[PDB]
Amino acid sequence: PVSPALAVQQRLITDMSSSMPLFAGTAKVQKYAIPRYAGHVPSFPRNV
Amino acid sequence: REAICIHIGQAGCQVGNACWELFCLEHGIQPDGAMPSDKTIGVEDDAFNTFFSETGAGKHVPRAVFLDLEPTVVDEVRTGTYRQLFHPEQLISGKEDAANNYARGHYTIGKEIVDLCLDRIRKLADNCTGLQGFLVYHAVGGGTGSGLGALLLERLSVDYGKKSKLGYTVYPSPQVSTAVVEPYNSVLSTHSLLEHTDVAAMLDNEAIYDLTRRNLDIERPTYTNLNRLIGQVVSSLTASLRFDGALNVDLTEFQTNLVPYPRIHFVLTSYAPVISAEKAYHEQLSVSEISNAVFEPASMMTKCDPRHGKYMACCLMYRGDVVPKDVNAAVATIKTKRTIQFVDWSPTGFKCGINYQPPTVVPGGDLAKVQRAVCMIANSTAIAEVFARIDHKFDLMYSKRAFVHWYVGEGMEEGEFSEAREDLAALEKDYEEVGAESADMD
Amino acid sequence: REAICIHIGQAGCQVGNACWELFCLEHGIQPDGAMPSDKTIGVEDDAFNTFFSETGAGKHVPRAVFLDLEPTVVDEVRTGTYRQLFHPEQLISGKEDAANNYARGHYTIGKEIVDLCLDRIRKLADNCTGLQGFLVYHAVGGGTGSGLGALLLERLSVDYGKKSKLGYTVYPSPQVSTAVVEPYNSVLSTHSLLEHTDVAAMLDNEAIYDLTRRNLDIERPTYTNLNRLIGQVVSSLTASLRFDGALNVDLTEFQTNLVPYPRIHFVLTSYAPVISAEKAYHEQLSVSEISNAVFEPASMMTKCDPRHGKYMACCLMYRGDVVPKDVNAAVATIKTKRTIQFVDWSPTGFKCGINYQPPTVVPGGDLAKVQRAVCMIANSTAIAEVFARIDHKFDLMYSKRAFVHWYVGEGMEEGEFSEAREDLAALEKDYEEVGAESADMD
Amino acid sequence: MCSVHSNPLGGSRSRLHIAPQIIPAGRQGSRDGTTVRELTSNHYSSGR
Amino acid sequence: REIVCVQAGQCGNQIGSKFWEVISDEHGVDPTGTYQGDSDLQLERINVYFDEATGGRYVPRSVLIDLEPGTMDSVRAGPYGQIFRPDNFIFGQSGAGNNWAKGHYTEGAELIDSVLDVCCKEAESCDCLQGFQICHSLGGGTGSGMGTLLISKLREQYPDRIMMTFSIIPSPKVSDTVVEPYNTTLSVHQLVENSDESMCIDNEALYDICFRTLKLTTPTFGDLNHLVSAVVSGVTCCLRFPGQLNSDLRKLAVNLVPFPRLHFFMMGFAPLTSRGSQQYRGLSVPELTQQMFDAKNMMQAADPRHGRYLTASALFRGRMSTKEVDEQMLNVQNKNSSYFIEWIPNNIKSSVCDIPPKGLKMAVTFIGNNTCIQEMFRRVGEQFTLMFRRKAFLHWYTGEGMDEMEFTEAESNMNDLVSEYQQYQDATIE
Amino acid sequence: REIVCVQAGQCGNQIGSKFWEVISDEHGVDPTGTYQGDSDLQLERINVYFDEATGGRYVPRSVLIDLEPGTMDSVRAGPYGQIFRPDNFIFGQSGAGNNWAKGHYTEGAELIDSVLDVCCKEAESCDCLQGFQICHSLGGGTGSGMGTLLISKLREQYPDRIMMTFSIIPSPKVSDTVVEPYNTTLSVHQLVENSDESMCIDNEALYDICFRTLKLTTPTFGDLNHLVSAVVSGVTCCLRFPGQLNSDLRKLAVNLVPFPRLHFFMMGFAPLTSRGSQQYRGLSVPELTQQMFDAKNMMQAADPRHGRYLTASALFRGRMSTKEVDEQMLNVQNKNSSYFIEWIPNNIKSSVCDIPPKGLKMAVTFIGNNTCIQEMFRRVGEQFTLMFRRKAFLHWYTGEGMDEMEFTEAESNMNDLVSEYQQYQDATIE
Ligand SMILES: Nc1nc2c(ncn2[C@@H]2O[C@H](COP(=O)(O)OP(=O)(O)OP(=O)(O)O)[C@@H](O)[C@H]2O)c(=O)[nH]1
Ligand SMILES: Nc1nc2c(ncn2[C@@H]2O[C@H](COP(=O)(O)OP(=O)(O)OP(=O)(O)O)[C@@H](O)[C@H]2O)c(=O)[nH]1
Ligand SMILES: Nc1nc2c(ncn2[C@@H]2O[C@H](COP(=O)(O)OP(=O)(O)O)[C@@H](O)[C@H]2O)c(=O)[nH]1
Ligand SMILES: Nc1nc2c(ncn2[C@@H]2O[C@H](COP(=O)(O)OP(=O)(O)O)[C@@H](O)[C@H]2O)c(=O)[nH]1
Ligand SMILES: [Mg+2]
Ligand SMILES: [Mg+2]
């Protein structure tokens, strides 16, 4: 049941990716910022 | 119809935030770029097109780039409230600042980042069908504003050619100062700006502080107030493109009417009904009083005194409920005054504009709501005093080459200082010669 | 209508997994070869026939062979998820690899395996009624891909004759490298491939890495991403066979339009809307924007700069919702550009194709979903720079006979190195001569 | 889930639409019912 | 006997919109184009300004040109805008820049061929063609440059017909544009060669009409453009309705112009009077004649008391005796005899038309040829000479491509026109 | 007096399907083949394009040929596809490869006997045979090569009839195929010997028709093929309906061709006008005549203003006066007299037919013989000379078997055709 909202569409393809563990510590996985972000993003689930 | 905005460095990005908040609130775009889904006015008018393009799903996106060498300000934009409005490619940030060195920005660091900026501007200009100029916001006192502003305007001027380039520029205040090396950066900036700009708008922070103290009753102003005032001025000048009116003014008409000779393009700006909410219900605000107001020295946003010079041209923008007869009576009354003088070679001294859209009220704002406003841009010989003071401060510092080793180590020849100082001296002589009154009777 | 796919070695089989995943998802065949009962059609349709054949019980099976000398990758296909899709006889595997030796694959080991492959290809070609070419996937950097690919193409070219054979080829990247002996294998492969292929498309992993870093936001790409991009390209080129459209394109017209002289058959490939899902909703994607994109070097999948050469022919494939008038306007705008140059002997430089089926979106994929796409194959003199660096690396090693004893032990005369190096020198001279302007009109 | 594509620009065979829940990106073109026989045959559009 | 109208620039298109409102109202044509009139007299000359489209409809024979569609979009959005033929709207993609040279040389020549093609298509459909009618301002950029360009092309293509212009010229007081003197001088140079008869209006005179005569509290451009549309629609009234003494544009030209350069005229319309006073005094020819010669009712800043009348014409609409007309024009000529040039034995032409404008019992429009127009041209030449000595803004025009010799030629031609007016003013017979 | 149609290649089959839609509509034939018309005028000439099959049905006298069945499968799936006789679809098993030599020499000789067998079967069934009609593109591969092969065979077998072709030719701005100049040159070489009359269309001209005149936002190949089907069905209208001045294809040829090589013509169809504008302008013979000669309404990129008319023909459909037609053609010839060749005393033929196409009150199709066609051939010859000097793609054609002497012959013949047009353009009485 995918909603037609914009943010759901933007993040649905990323959520289903087959290389999710390889994206850790990058700007894609930070849901609180637009991509190509510059600040620090944690790479451990306790910090995340 | 279309205009492209380029924001450079810290002052230009912070003023950009105020500009785009204001332009959103006047059109009605939500911070996420979507039109209100419950709004059913039906007359889906084209006025946004000057500043926005549609994706096709009905999201709005703005015609701007944000350029910086330090990450922090762009990361503030990326993490703020307007995250979804901008395309992420549009927000360009480097690794390290230009460290108050014009030389570092122009030669060493800006040279790597500049090609991304040109590729983005090309991608914007290709998605236009009646582009009629660039708006640029920067400060000439800092390193990235000086170096990237010069380099980017030079490249734009070669690639795009005849297209107009209008700059809104924050100059170093005559006694308020923020960094030691401001005179050097302002001289080196102005040398490049002379060749590569069509109109230059002059701002001084001391005037906007004085204006906020005298008219508003604010003892402790901060940058958000100044930036909101600047945004209002830019909205007033660009309103003529966006809404119906009696006397429209296209951006090429500004250049034709304001610039008599190709170097004499630096202009003063002022805004009339800057007033607080408590005062606003005690007074009527007719056309003739605000027309008299824009000529009072308490109104300017640049620290210069116009009583020490002669006007060459004035452009008066009226927006809101105004009738042409009141504009004509006001301009004729101004013309009668004895303390307002025009150069004798300019008999028809005035340009008028009349627009129906009243000024917008911003939810957190400090200005009152008013039915009419007038905004003025004017060309006057008084501006020569600002350059004379920058050049005097340069001569004091340059007598000992006080900091020059940084600039020469970071890549600049010492000769460039003397060339720029002689060019600004020649600009002073140009303002001396144009203001000469001569008798052809001979 | 029908096409047969031949997959050789490691890169070719791994790219094959992504290709057949995609072709299944586009037609709707489940991984076990059974069409679901819900995928009904109002009228009976044949589009699957290009890639699948039915046994009559309604299972689907694909027109492909997987060829390898090492078992591991084919055993991986046999034990994976797609076990039931392939016929087990189609999956042929040897005992031991060609150990990066072209000589071992061509002379020693492939000579045993080649007759089974020929029997399978014959068994496929007998179950056809309009076979119209071979698609071949291999890398020229490794031993079995070069040696067995050449030997098999030679046998196919004698047995089948005039039928067209189109190759997709992974060439050694210009500074990323994986093995020491890559130049020798690539030169010796290219010597055989020159005579026995009609068009060869060149790929470099460094370009697809750059594309996945720059356009997509992937910091750590892996081979599955590259193989999915290649699969998308192949689906775009073969879509013209499979779905309705305004301007269809059969595989023989590619050979007729792109190859001017029989040796000048190496082509560049690019794909336009490689874009992430978050970027895709901030921007419109009109015809003219993607047409302008495919000519920018940021869109290419091979590491060469076309500004250092001249185009001879371009073939532009549009799929999705596109109308011919915008394609015509776009191509005329491209023709206007000054940084795009065609040889003066090729005035009618363009071929167009237009198909109605938009590109498919794969559930685990990294590309966004988009309504239209364009794919380009183009012939350009810039490719001569790619060969020159391989030839320089060959000259560096061969001046001291750096590794030759391996090749001589597995069955090759030393003379074969000099012959191949002279053939590549002649190919360089051909690219010098074709690009010289003819101006002797007197 | 799958559906059947429409045929606005031509064609006669049915086409398969894959995963309609994902909303396509990019601008949808401007369309209208104005065709060439409506213009070259329907002169009686107004009964004045 | 059909007229083709051209509306150019912002001022011209707005005044034209008001003109077509007034004319469509007078002939009872609904904004859908349907005839809804109430007398055959309305129908029998509808052809003069309208062409007939199929099943009832009428379309107005006018071409609209502008460089940015903003004005075009505003007129199309107006209440009568739908009547105009879609193919008749011509617009570019970039502005005149308030620059005459840009409007004449760069964007002008790009569009101008399509305007002549439309004008020829419209002209060749007429069974017999009378003169053209053009509305534009002289102080603007596209108005001045393209108006005079189009006038030159139409005078080349139709030299035996009449060329008529209505033109707005800069007030000495209302400075709306800094570069007004250049555009005015170059446009008057083009007009005095090209035009057959040219009418001039000052916005200041319309303001003084509104404030003093009509006592309007808050006038707007709709009122000024209504006054202009009233005189414009009045001059042609005798072309298209019966009367006791018919008149025609060519007959007007023959009676008003003594020598071919002296063809610039003043306009007036008489029964302007506020709604409160009108109940206390009925209209009559002495009253109309008194308003008709009062300078308060004249649409130029120059005053008749500083010049002399060469010729004048009055066209009366309404049911009235010819005897009163004849004796009023004789009595006015005899009583004020020093202000009329003495070597013409009778300076006033009269004309009488049966059909007045709706809601007025009678009306007259007055056209006057007076030497006081020389003071206006002298003022424009003065402002040009002040500006030209210092090269004040010339680089824009030179960058478009104009030779400086054009400015000295145009100045010389205007100075000779002023001198010629002054010479005929002060001539004497011994 | 019955015509046999041949449709070849993708363009030809697509235009043909739409043509037979238009023709089946005009005669009221149901897609089942049953006659359902509502006037005897439809039935009494149905034989011209249809043969009658048993128990009601009518079948259209057309042969469909292509080298790959993809197009035929698309047309068979269409709404009228069932009407076509199954035995009339002839197809091979591999494509033309966009190569003229392949299409003419290798698969051509393989298929040609079965197409000729079908064409003879259709021809010998006629009681009296009129000319053949062929639709194809000249830039393609099977269309150009196999179309001209079939044309040559039919000209051998029926040399006394007329051979007429409608042909699509490469645009001046963007190519759809790289090797277009060779295929065009060889096809024009075949046509100028074999053909009696050849019609030419530029896709760029149809795009400009749609955008400027019809203002379509998103035109498609269906619209272009409808315009072509409209003109094709219009040329034959006088063959198959009554009228005040009947005309015939042979009568057209006799009046249009002054000398046997000068047989390439431009086409147009007049009452094209956008849905927004249609409320503003009624149909009349002056309006149709004015639009008919406007180069905007001509379906080729060359413009008449750069050439001269040798001859022209206009076929009018509808109830109209002969006086308006003759006097309009005289007035147009007199006013533009410099553009008509002076040693012919009257260049225009007219014809009038009583029955217009349904839903139009009147229509005209225009055929013009103008010397500006020389610019297209000159452009193609230039591109050929650039390609031929460098042997740019020649090995494909030589590998099929062509001698280069064919290429030099075709180039020389095209250059002589251009010279002949230029010589007749500048001829004089002396
Ligand atoms: N009005 C206004 N002025 C500002 C603002 N920020 C800085 N300034 C002024 O601009 C000048 C400093 O220029 P900066 O923008 O800091 O220089 P920069 O672009 O950051 O260049 P770098 O220091 O090399 O990064 C001083 O005169 C400041 O007073 C602001 O937010 N609003
Ligand atoms: N894009 C892409 N490149 C690959 C892939 N697998 C291998 N390569 C590249 O191809 C080259 C190696 O060729 P291989 O396919 O491993 O050689 P081979 O066919 O296995 O030959 P042998 O080693 O003798 O078995 C290197 O440049 C690799 O980077 C792949 O799956 N995708
Ligand atoms: N009476 C009247 N004058 C106008 C109107 N609009 C503009 N003007 C005047 O015309 C002059 C400006 O010319 P403009 O029409 O803008 O020239 P353009 O730019 O070439 O179209 C100024 O004197 C304005 O006061 C109007 O609607 N009515
Ligand atoms: N007007 C029109 N032109 C077409 C159509 N289909 C193809 N063309 C044009 O014809 C040329 C291609 O020739 P084509 O029919 O493919 O040759 P073939 O391969 O031998 O059948 C190009 O210029 C196309 O633009 C169509 O349906 N209508
Ligand atoms: Mg900073
Ligand atoms: Mg291996």
Q: What is the 3-state secondary structure (H, E, C) of chain B?
A: CEEEEEEEHHHHHHHHHHHHHHHHHHHCCCCCCECCCCCCCCCCCHHHHHCEEECCCCEEEECEEEEECCCHHHHHHHHCCCCCCCCHHHEEECCCCCCCCHHHHHHHHHHHHHHHHHHHHHHHHCCCCCEEEEEEEEECCCHHHHHHHHHHHHHHHHHHCCCCEEEEEECCCCCCCCCCCHHHHHHHHHHHHHHCCCEEEEECHHHHHHHHHHCCCCCCCCHHHHHHHHHHHHHHHHHHHHCCEEECCCHHHHHHHHCCCCCCCEEEEEECCCCCHHHHCCCCCCHHHHHHHHCCHHHECCCCCHHHCCEEEEEEEEEECCCHHHHHHHHHHHHHCCCCCECCCCCCCEEEEEECCCCCCCCCCCCCCCCEEEEEEEEEHHHHHHHHHHHHHHHHHHCCCCCHHHHHHCCCCCHHHHHHHHHHHHHHHHHHHHCCCCCCCC
List of chain A residues whose C-beta atoms are within 8 Å of the C-beta of residue D23: 4, 9
Nearest CA in chain C to D5: C357
Q: Is E243 exposed, middle or buried (0-12, 13-18, 19+ CB in 10 A)?
A: middle
3-state secondary structure (DSSP) of residue E207: helix
Lookup: tokens for E349: 């032409």
CA of E414 to the centre of ligand 3 (A): 23
Chain C CB within 8 Å of residue F393 CB? yes
Measured between beta carbons, the chain E residues lying within 8 angstroms of B345 are 386-387, 389-390, 392
From CA B420, how far away is CA B426, in angstroms rounded?
A: 10
Per DSSP, the three-state class of C111 is helix
Q: How many of the other CB atoms lie within 10 Å of CB of E132?
A: 23
> Under a CB-based contact definition with an 8 Å cutoff, are residues F209 and F272 in contact?
yes
Query: Contact, C199 vs C262, CB < 8 A?
Result: no
Chain B residue numbers touching C283 (CB-CB < 8 A): 55, 61, 87
| Euclidean distance between CA atoms C76 and B296, whole angstroms | 85
Give me the residue label for tokens 């009253």.
E287
- Angle formed by the axes of helices C205-214 and C223-242, to 10°? 100
In the three-class reduction of DSSP (H, G, I as helix; E, B as strand; rest coil), residue C441 is classed as coil
CB D34 within 8 Å of CB F277: no
First to last CA, chain A: 27
The CA distance from F68 to C250, in Å, is 10
Q: How many CB pairs below 8 Å do chains A and D form together?
A: 7
Three-state secondary structure call for residue E362 = strand
Q: Do F290 and E57 make contact, defined as CB atoms within 8 angstroms?
A: no
Q: Comparing C-alpha atoms, which of C342, C347, C330, C239 is closest to residue C285?
A: C330
Q: How many residues does chain A have?
A: 48
Q: How far apart are CA E414 and CA E188, in angstroms?
A: 7
- As a whole number of angstroms, the distance between CA E179 and CA E144 comes to 12
Instruction: Characterize the bridge pairing of strands F129-137 and F163-169.
Output: parallel
Where on the phi/psi map is residue C157: left (φ > 0), alpha (ψ -120 to 50), or beta?
A: alpha
Backbone Cα Rg of chain C: 22
Ligand 4 atom at shortest distance from the alpha carbon of C248: 16
Q: Which of C6, C7, C10, when mutated, tests ligand 2's pocket best, judged by the most ligand atoms within 8 Å of its CB?
A: C10
- Sign of the alpha-carbon torsion through E67, E68, E69, E74: negative
Are C288 and C330 contacting, i.e. CB atoms less than 8 angstroms apart? yes
Check if E184 has its Cβ closer than 6 Å to any atom of ligand 3.
no
Query: What is each CA distance from B438 to B310, B344, E379, F304, in whole angstroms?
Result: 14, 9, 22, 62
Q: Which helix (H) or strand (E) holds F276?
A: none
In angstroms, the Cα distances linking C346 to B129, B154, C437, C441, D28 are 32, 37, 11, 17, 36
Dist. CA C95–CA C129, nearest whole Å: 35
- Which tokens sit at F156? 């051998």
Residue B34 sits at the chain A interface (C-beta within 8 Å) = yes
Is residue E133 a contact partner of residue E59, using CB atoms and an 8 Å limit?
Answer: no
Joined tokens for residue F310:
């040798």
C-alpha A39, offset from chain centre: 14
Q: Which residue of F has its CA nearest to D10?
A: F222
Q: Which residues fall within 8 angstroms of residue E416, CB to CB, at 6 or more apart? A: none
The answer to whether the CB of B104 falls within 8 A of the CB of B144 is no
- Mark C300-321 as b/e (b = at least 16 C-beta within 10 Å): bbbbbebeebbbbbbbbbbbbb
> Ligand 1 test: best mutation among B6, B170, B386, B390, most atoms within 8 Å of CB?
B170
How far is Cα B169 from Cα B178, in angstroms, rounded to an integer?
16
Q: Scanning the structure block, which residue is given the tokens 């999956």? A: C91
Cα separation, E311 vs F236, whole angstroms: 68
CA dist., res. E141 & res. B257, Å (int): 12
Residues belonging to chain D with any Cβ–Cβ distance to chain A shorter than 8 Å: 21-23
Q: Which of F150, F178, F190, F141 is nearest to F64 (CA)?
A: F150
Sheet with F197-202: list strands edge to edge: F89-91, F62-66, F2-8, F129-137, F163-169, F197-202, F264-269, F363-370, F309-317, F348-353
Dihedrals phi, psi of F272, to nearest 5 degrees:
-70, 120
Say which amino acid occupies F87. Answer: D
CA distance F358 to F356: 6
DSSP letters spanning F23-84: HHHHTTB-TTS-B--SSHHHHTTGGGTEEEPSTT-EEE-EEEEESSTHHHHHHHTSTTGGGS
Q: Which residue has the tokens 């190859």?
A: C259
Q: How far apart are CA E324 and CA C145, in angstroms?
A: 114
Residue with tokens 């506020």: E274
CA distance B244 to B247: 9
Tell me how far apart the alpha carbons of residues B35 and C343 are, in angstroms, rounded to a whole number.
Answer: 50
| Polymer length in residues for chain D | 48
| d(C-alpha E301, C-alpha E209), whole Å | 11
Beta carbons of C310 and C378 less than 8 angstroms apart: no
Tokens at D26, concatenated: 């990019």
List the single residue in D with minimal CA-CA distance to A3: D21
C228 φ, ψ (degrees, to nearest 5): -65, -40
Closest atom of ligand 1 relative to the B99 alpha carbon: 24
Mutate which of A18, A20, A22, A23 to test chain C, going by most C C-beta atoms within 10 A? A18
Residues 6+ apart with CB under 8 A from C351: C249, C253, C257, C258, C313, C314, C315, C316, F175, F176, F177, F178
Task: Give dist(CA D5, CA D17) in Å, integer.
Answer: 6
> Which residue's alpha carbon is nearest to atom 14 within ligand 2?
C142
Per-residue DSSP letters for C304-347?
--GGGS-EEEEEEEEEES--HHHHHHHHHHHHH-SS--B-TT--
Which DSSP string corresponds to C247-287?
E---HHHHHHHH-SSTT--EEEEEES----HHHHTTS---H
DSSP letters spanning C219-233: SS--HHHHHHHHHHH
Q: Do A33 and B89 touch (CB under 8 A)?
A: no
CB contact under 8 A, B88 and C283: no
d(C-alpha E70, C-alpha B244), whole Å: 8
Give whole-number Cα distances, C127 to B286, C5, C50, C124, F42, in Å: 92, 14, 12, 5, 52
φ and ψ at residue F425, rounded to 5 degrees: -60, -45
The distance between the two most distant Cα atoms of chain F, rounded to a whole number of Å, is 67
What are E41-47's contacts with CB under 8 Å, separation 24+? E41/E241, E41/E242, E41/E355, E45/E239, E45/E240, E45/E241, E47/E2
Interface A:B, Cβ pairs < 8 A? 29
> For ligand 3, atom 6, which residue shows the shortest CA distance?
E11
Active site residues of C: 253
Q: Distance between CA atoms of C276 and C279, rounded to whole angstroms?
A: 6
Q: Tell me, in Å, the resolution of the deposited structure.
A: 2.8
Decide if C244 and D13 are in contact by the 8 Å CB cutoff: yes
Contact B435, B343 (CB under 8 A): yes
| Structure-block tokens of residue F356 | 């217009």
Ion ligand 5 residues within 5 Å by Cβ: B 10, 97
**C344 neighbors C437 (Cβ within 8 angstroms):** yes
Q: Is E291 in the pocket of ligand 3 (CB under 6 A)?
A: no
**Count of CB atoms situated within 10 Å of the CB of E173:** 14
| Percent of chain C that is helix, strand, coil (3-state, to 5) | 45, 20, 35
Chains B and E form CB pairs within 8 A to the count of 82
Q: How many Å separate Cα E235 from the centre of its chain?
A: 10
C263: its two tokens: 């040796």
Q: How far is B93 from chain A (nearest CA, A)?
A: 8
Amino acid E197 reads E
The number of residues making up chain B comes to 442
* C140 CA to centre of ligand 2 in angstroms: 8
Give strand ranges (E) for E204-304: 264-269
Task: Please answer yes or no on whether A39 and B88 come within 8 Å at the CB atom.
Answer: no
Nearest atom of ligand 2 to the alpha carbon of C143: 24
* Ligand 2, pocket residues at CB < 6 Å: C 9-11, 14, 69-70, 97-100, 139, 141-145, 170, 178, 205, 223, 226-227
Q: Is C212 exposed, middle or buried (0-12, 13-18, 19+ CB in 10 A)?
A: buried
Bridge partners, C269 (sequence order): C377
Active site residue B112: no
The residue count of chain F comes to 430
What are A16's two structure tokens? 């289903």
Experimental method: cryo-EM
Token pair in block for residue F235: 């040329």
Bridge partner list, D2: D18
Give the residue, by CA position, lying nearest to ligand 1 atom 20. Answer: B10
Q: Is residue C373 within 8 Å of C294, Cβ to Cβ?
A: no
Q: In Å, how far is A35's CA from the nearest CA of chain B? A: 6
Phi-psi region at E283: left, alpha or beta (left = phi > 0; alpha = psi -120 to 50): beta
CB B260 within 8 A of CB B379: yes
DSSP C291: H
Angle at C123 between CA C119 and CA C127, to 5 degrees: 165
**Ligand 3 atom nearest to CA at E95:** 19
Do D and B make contact via 3 or more CB pairs under 8 A? The reply is yes
- Candidate list B206, B253, B416, B428, residue with the active-site label: B253
Find residues 72-131 of chain B whose CB sits inside 8 Å of chain A.
Answer: 74-75, 78-79, 83-84, 86, 88-89, 91, 93
Q: Name the residue among F213, F194, F208, F192 with its Cα closest to residue F149.
A: F194
Q: Give per-residue burial for C426-436: e unless 16+ CB within 10 Å, then b.
A: ebeeebeebbe
How many other CB atoms sit within 10 Å of the CB of residue F429? 5
Q: Residue B40 CB: number of other CB atoms within 10 A?
A: 6
Nearest CA to E65 out of E153, E186, E159, E170 is that of E153
Phi, then psi, of E79 in degrees rounded to 5: -70, -35
Contacting subunits of B (3+ beta carbon pairs below 8 A)? A, C, D, E
Residue E424 one-letter amino acid = Y
- Residues B416, B420, B423, B425: is their CA dihedral positive or negative? negative
Nearest to C189 by CA among C428, C425, C432, C416: C416
Contact B78, A33 (CB under 8 A): yes
The type of residue at E151 is I
Q: Measuring CA to CA, how many Å separate F117 from each of A8, B320, F122, F133, F157?
A: 64, 83, 9, 17, 12
The CA distances from residue B423 to B389, B426, C214, in Å, are 15, 5, 43
**Centroid of ligand 3 to alpha carbon of B247 (angstroms):** 8
Cα–Cα distance for residue pair C425/F16, rounded to 1 Å: 53
Interchain contact, E54 vs F281, CB within 8 Å? yes
E239 phi/psi in degrees, rounded to 5: -65, -30
Surface of F (149-178) touching C: CB under 8 A: 170-171, 173-178
List CB contacts (< 8 A) between A12 and chain C: 277
Question: Which chain B residue's Cα is nearest to E395?
Answer: B261
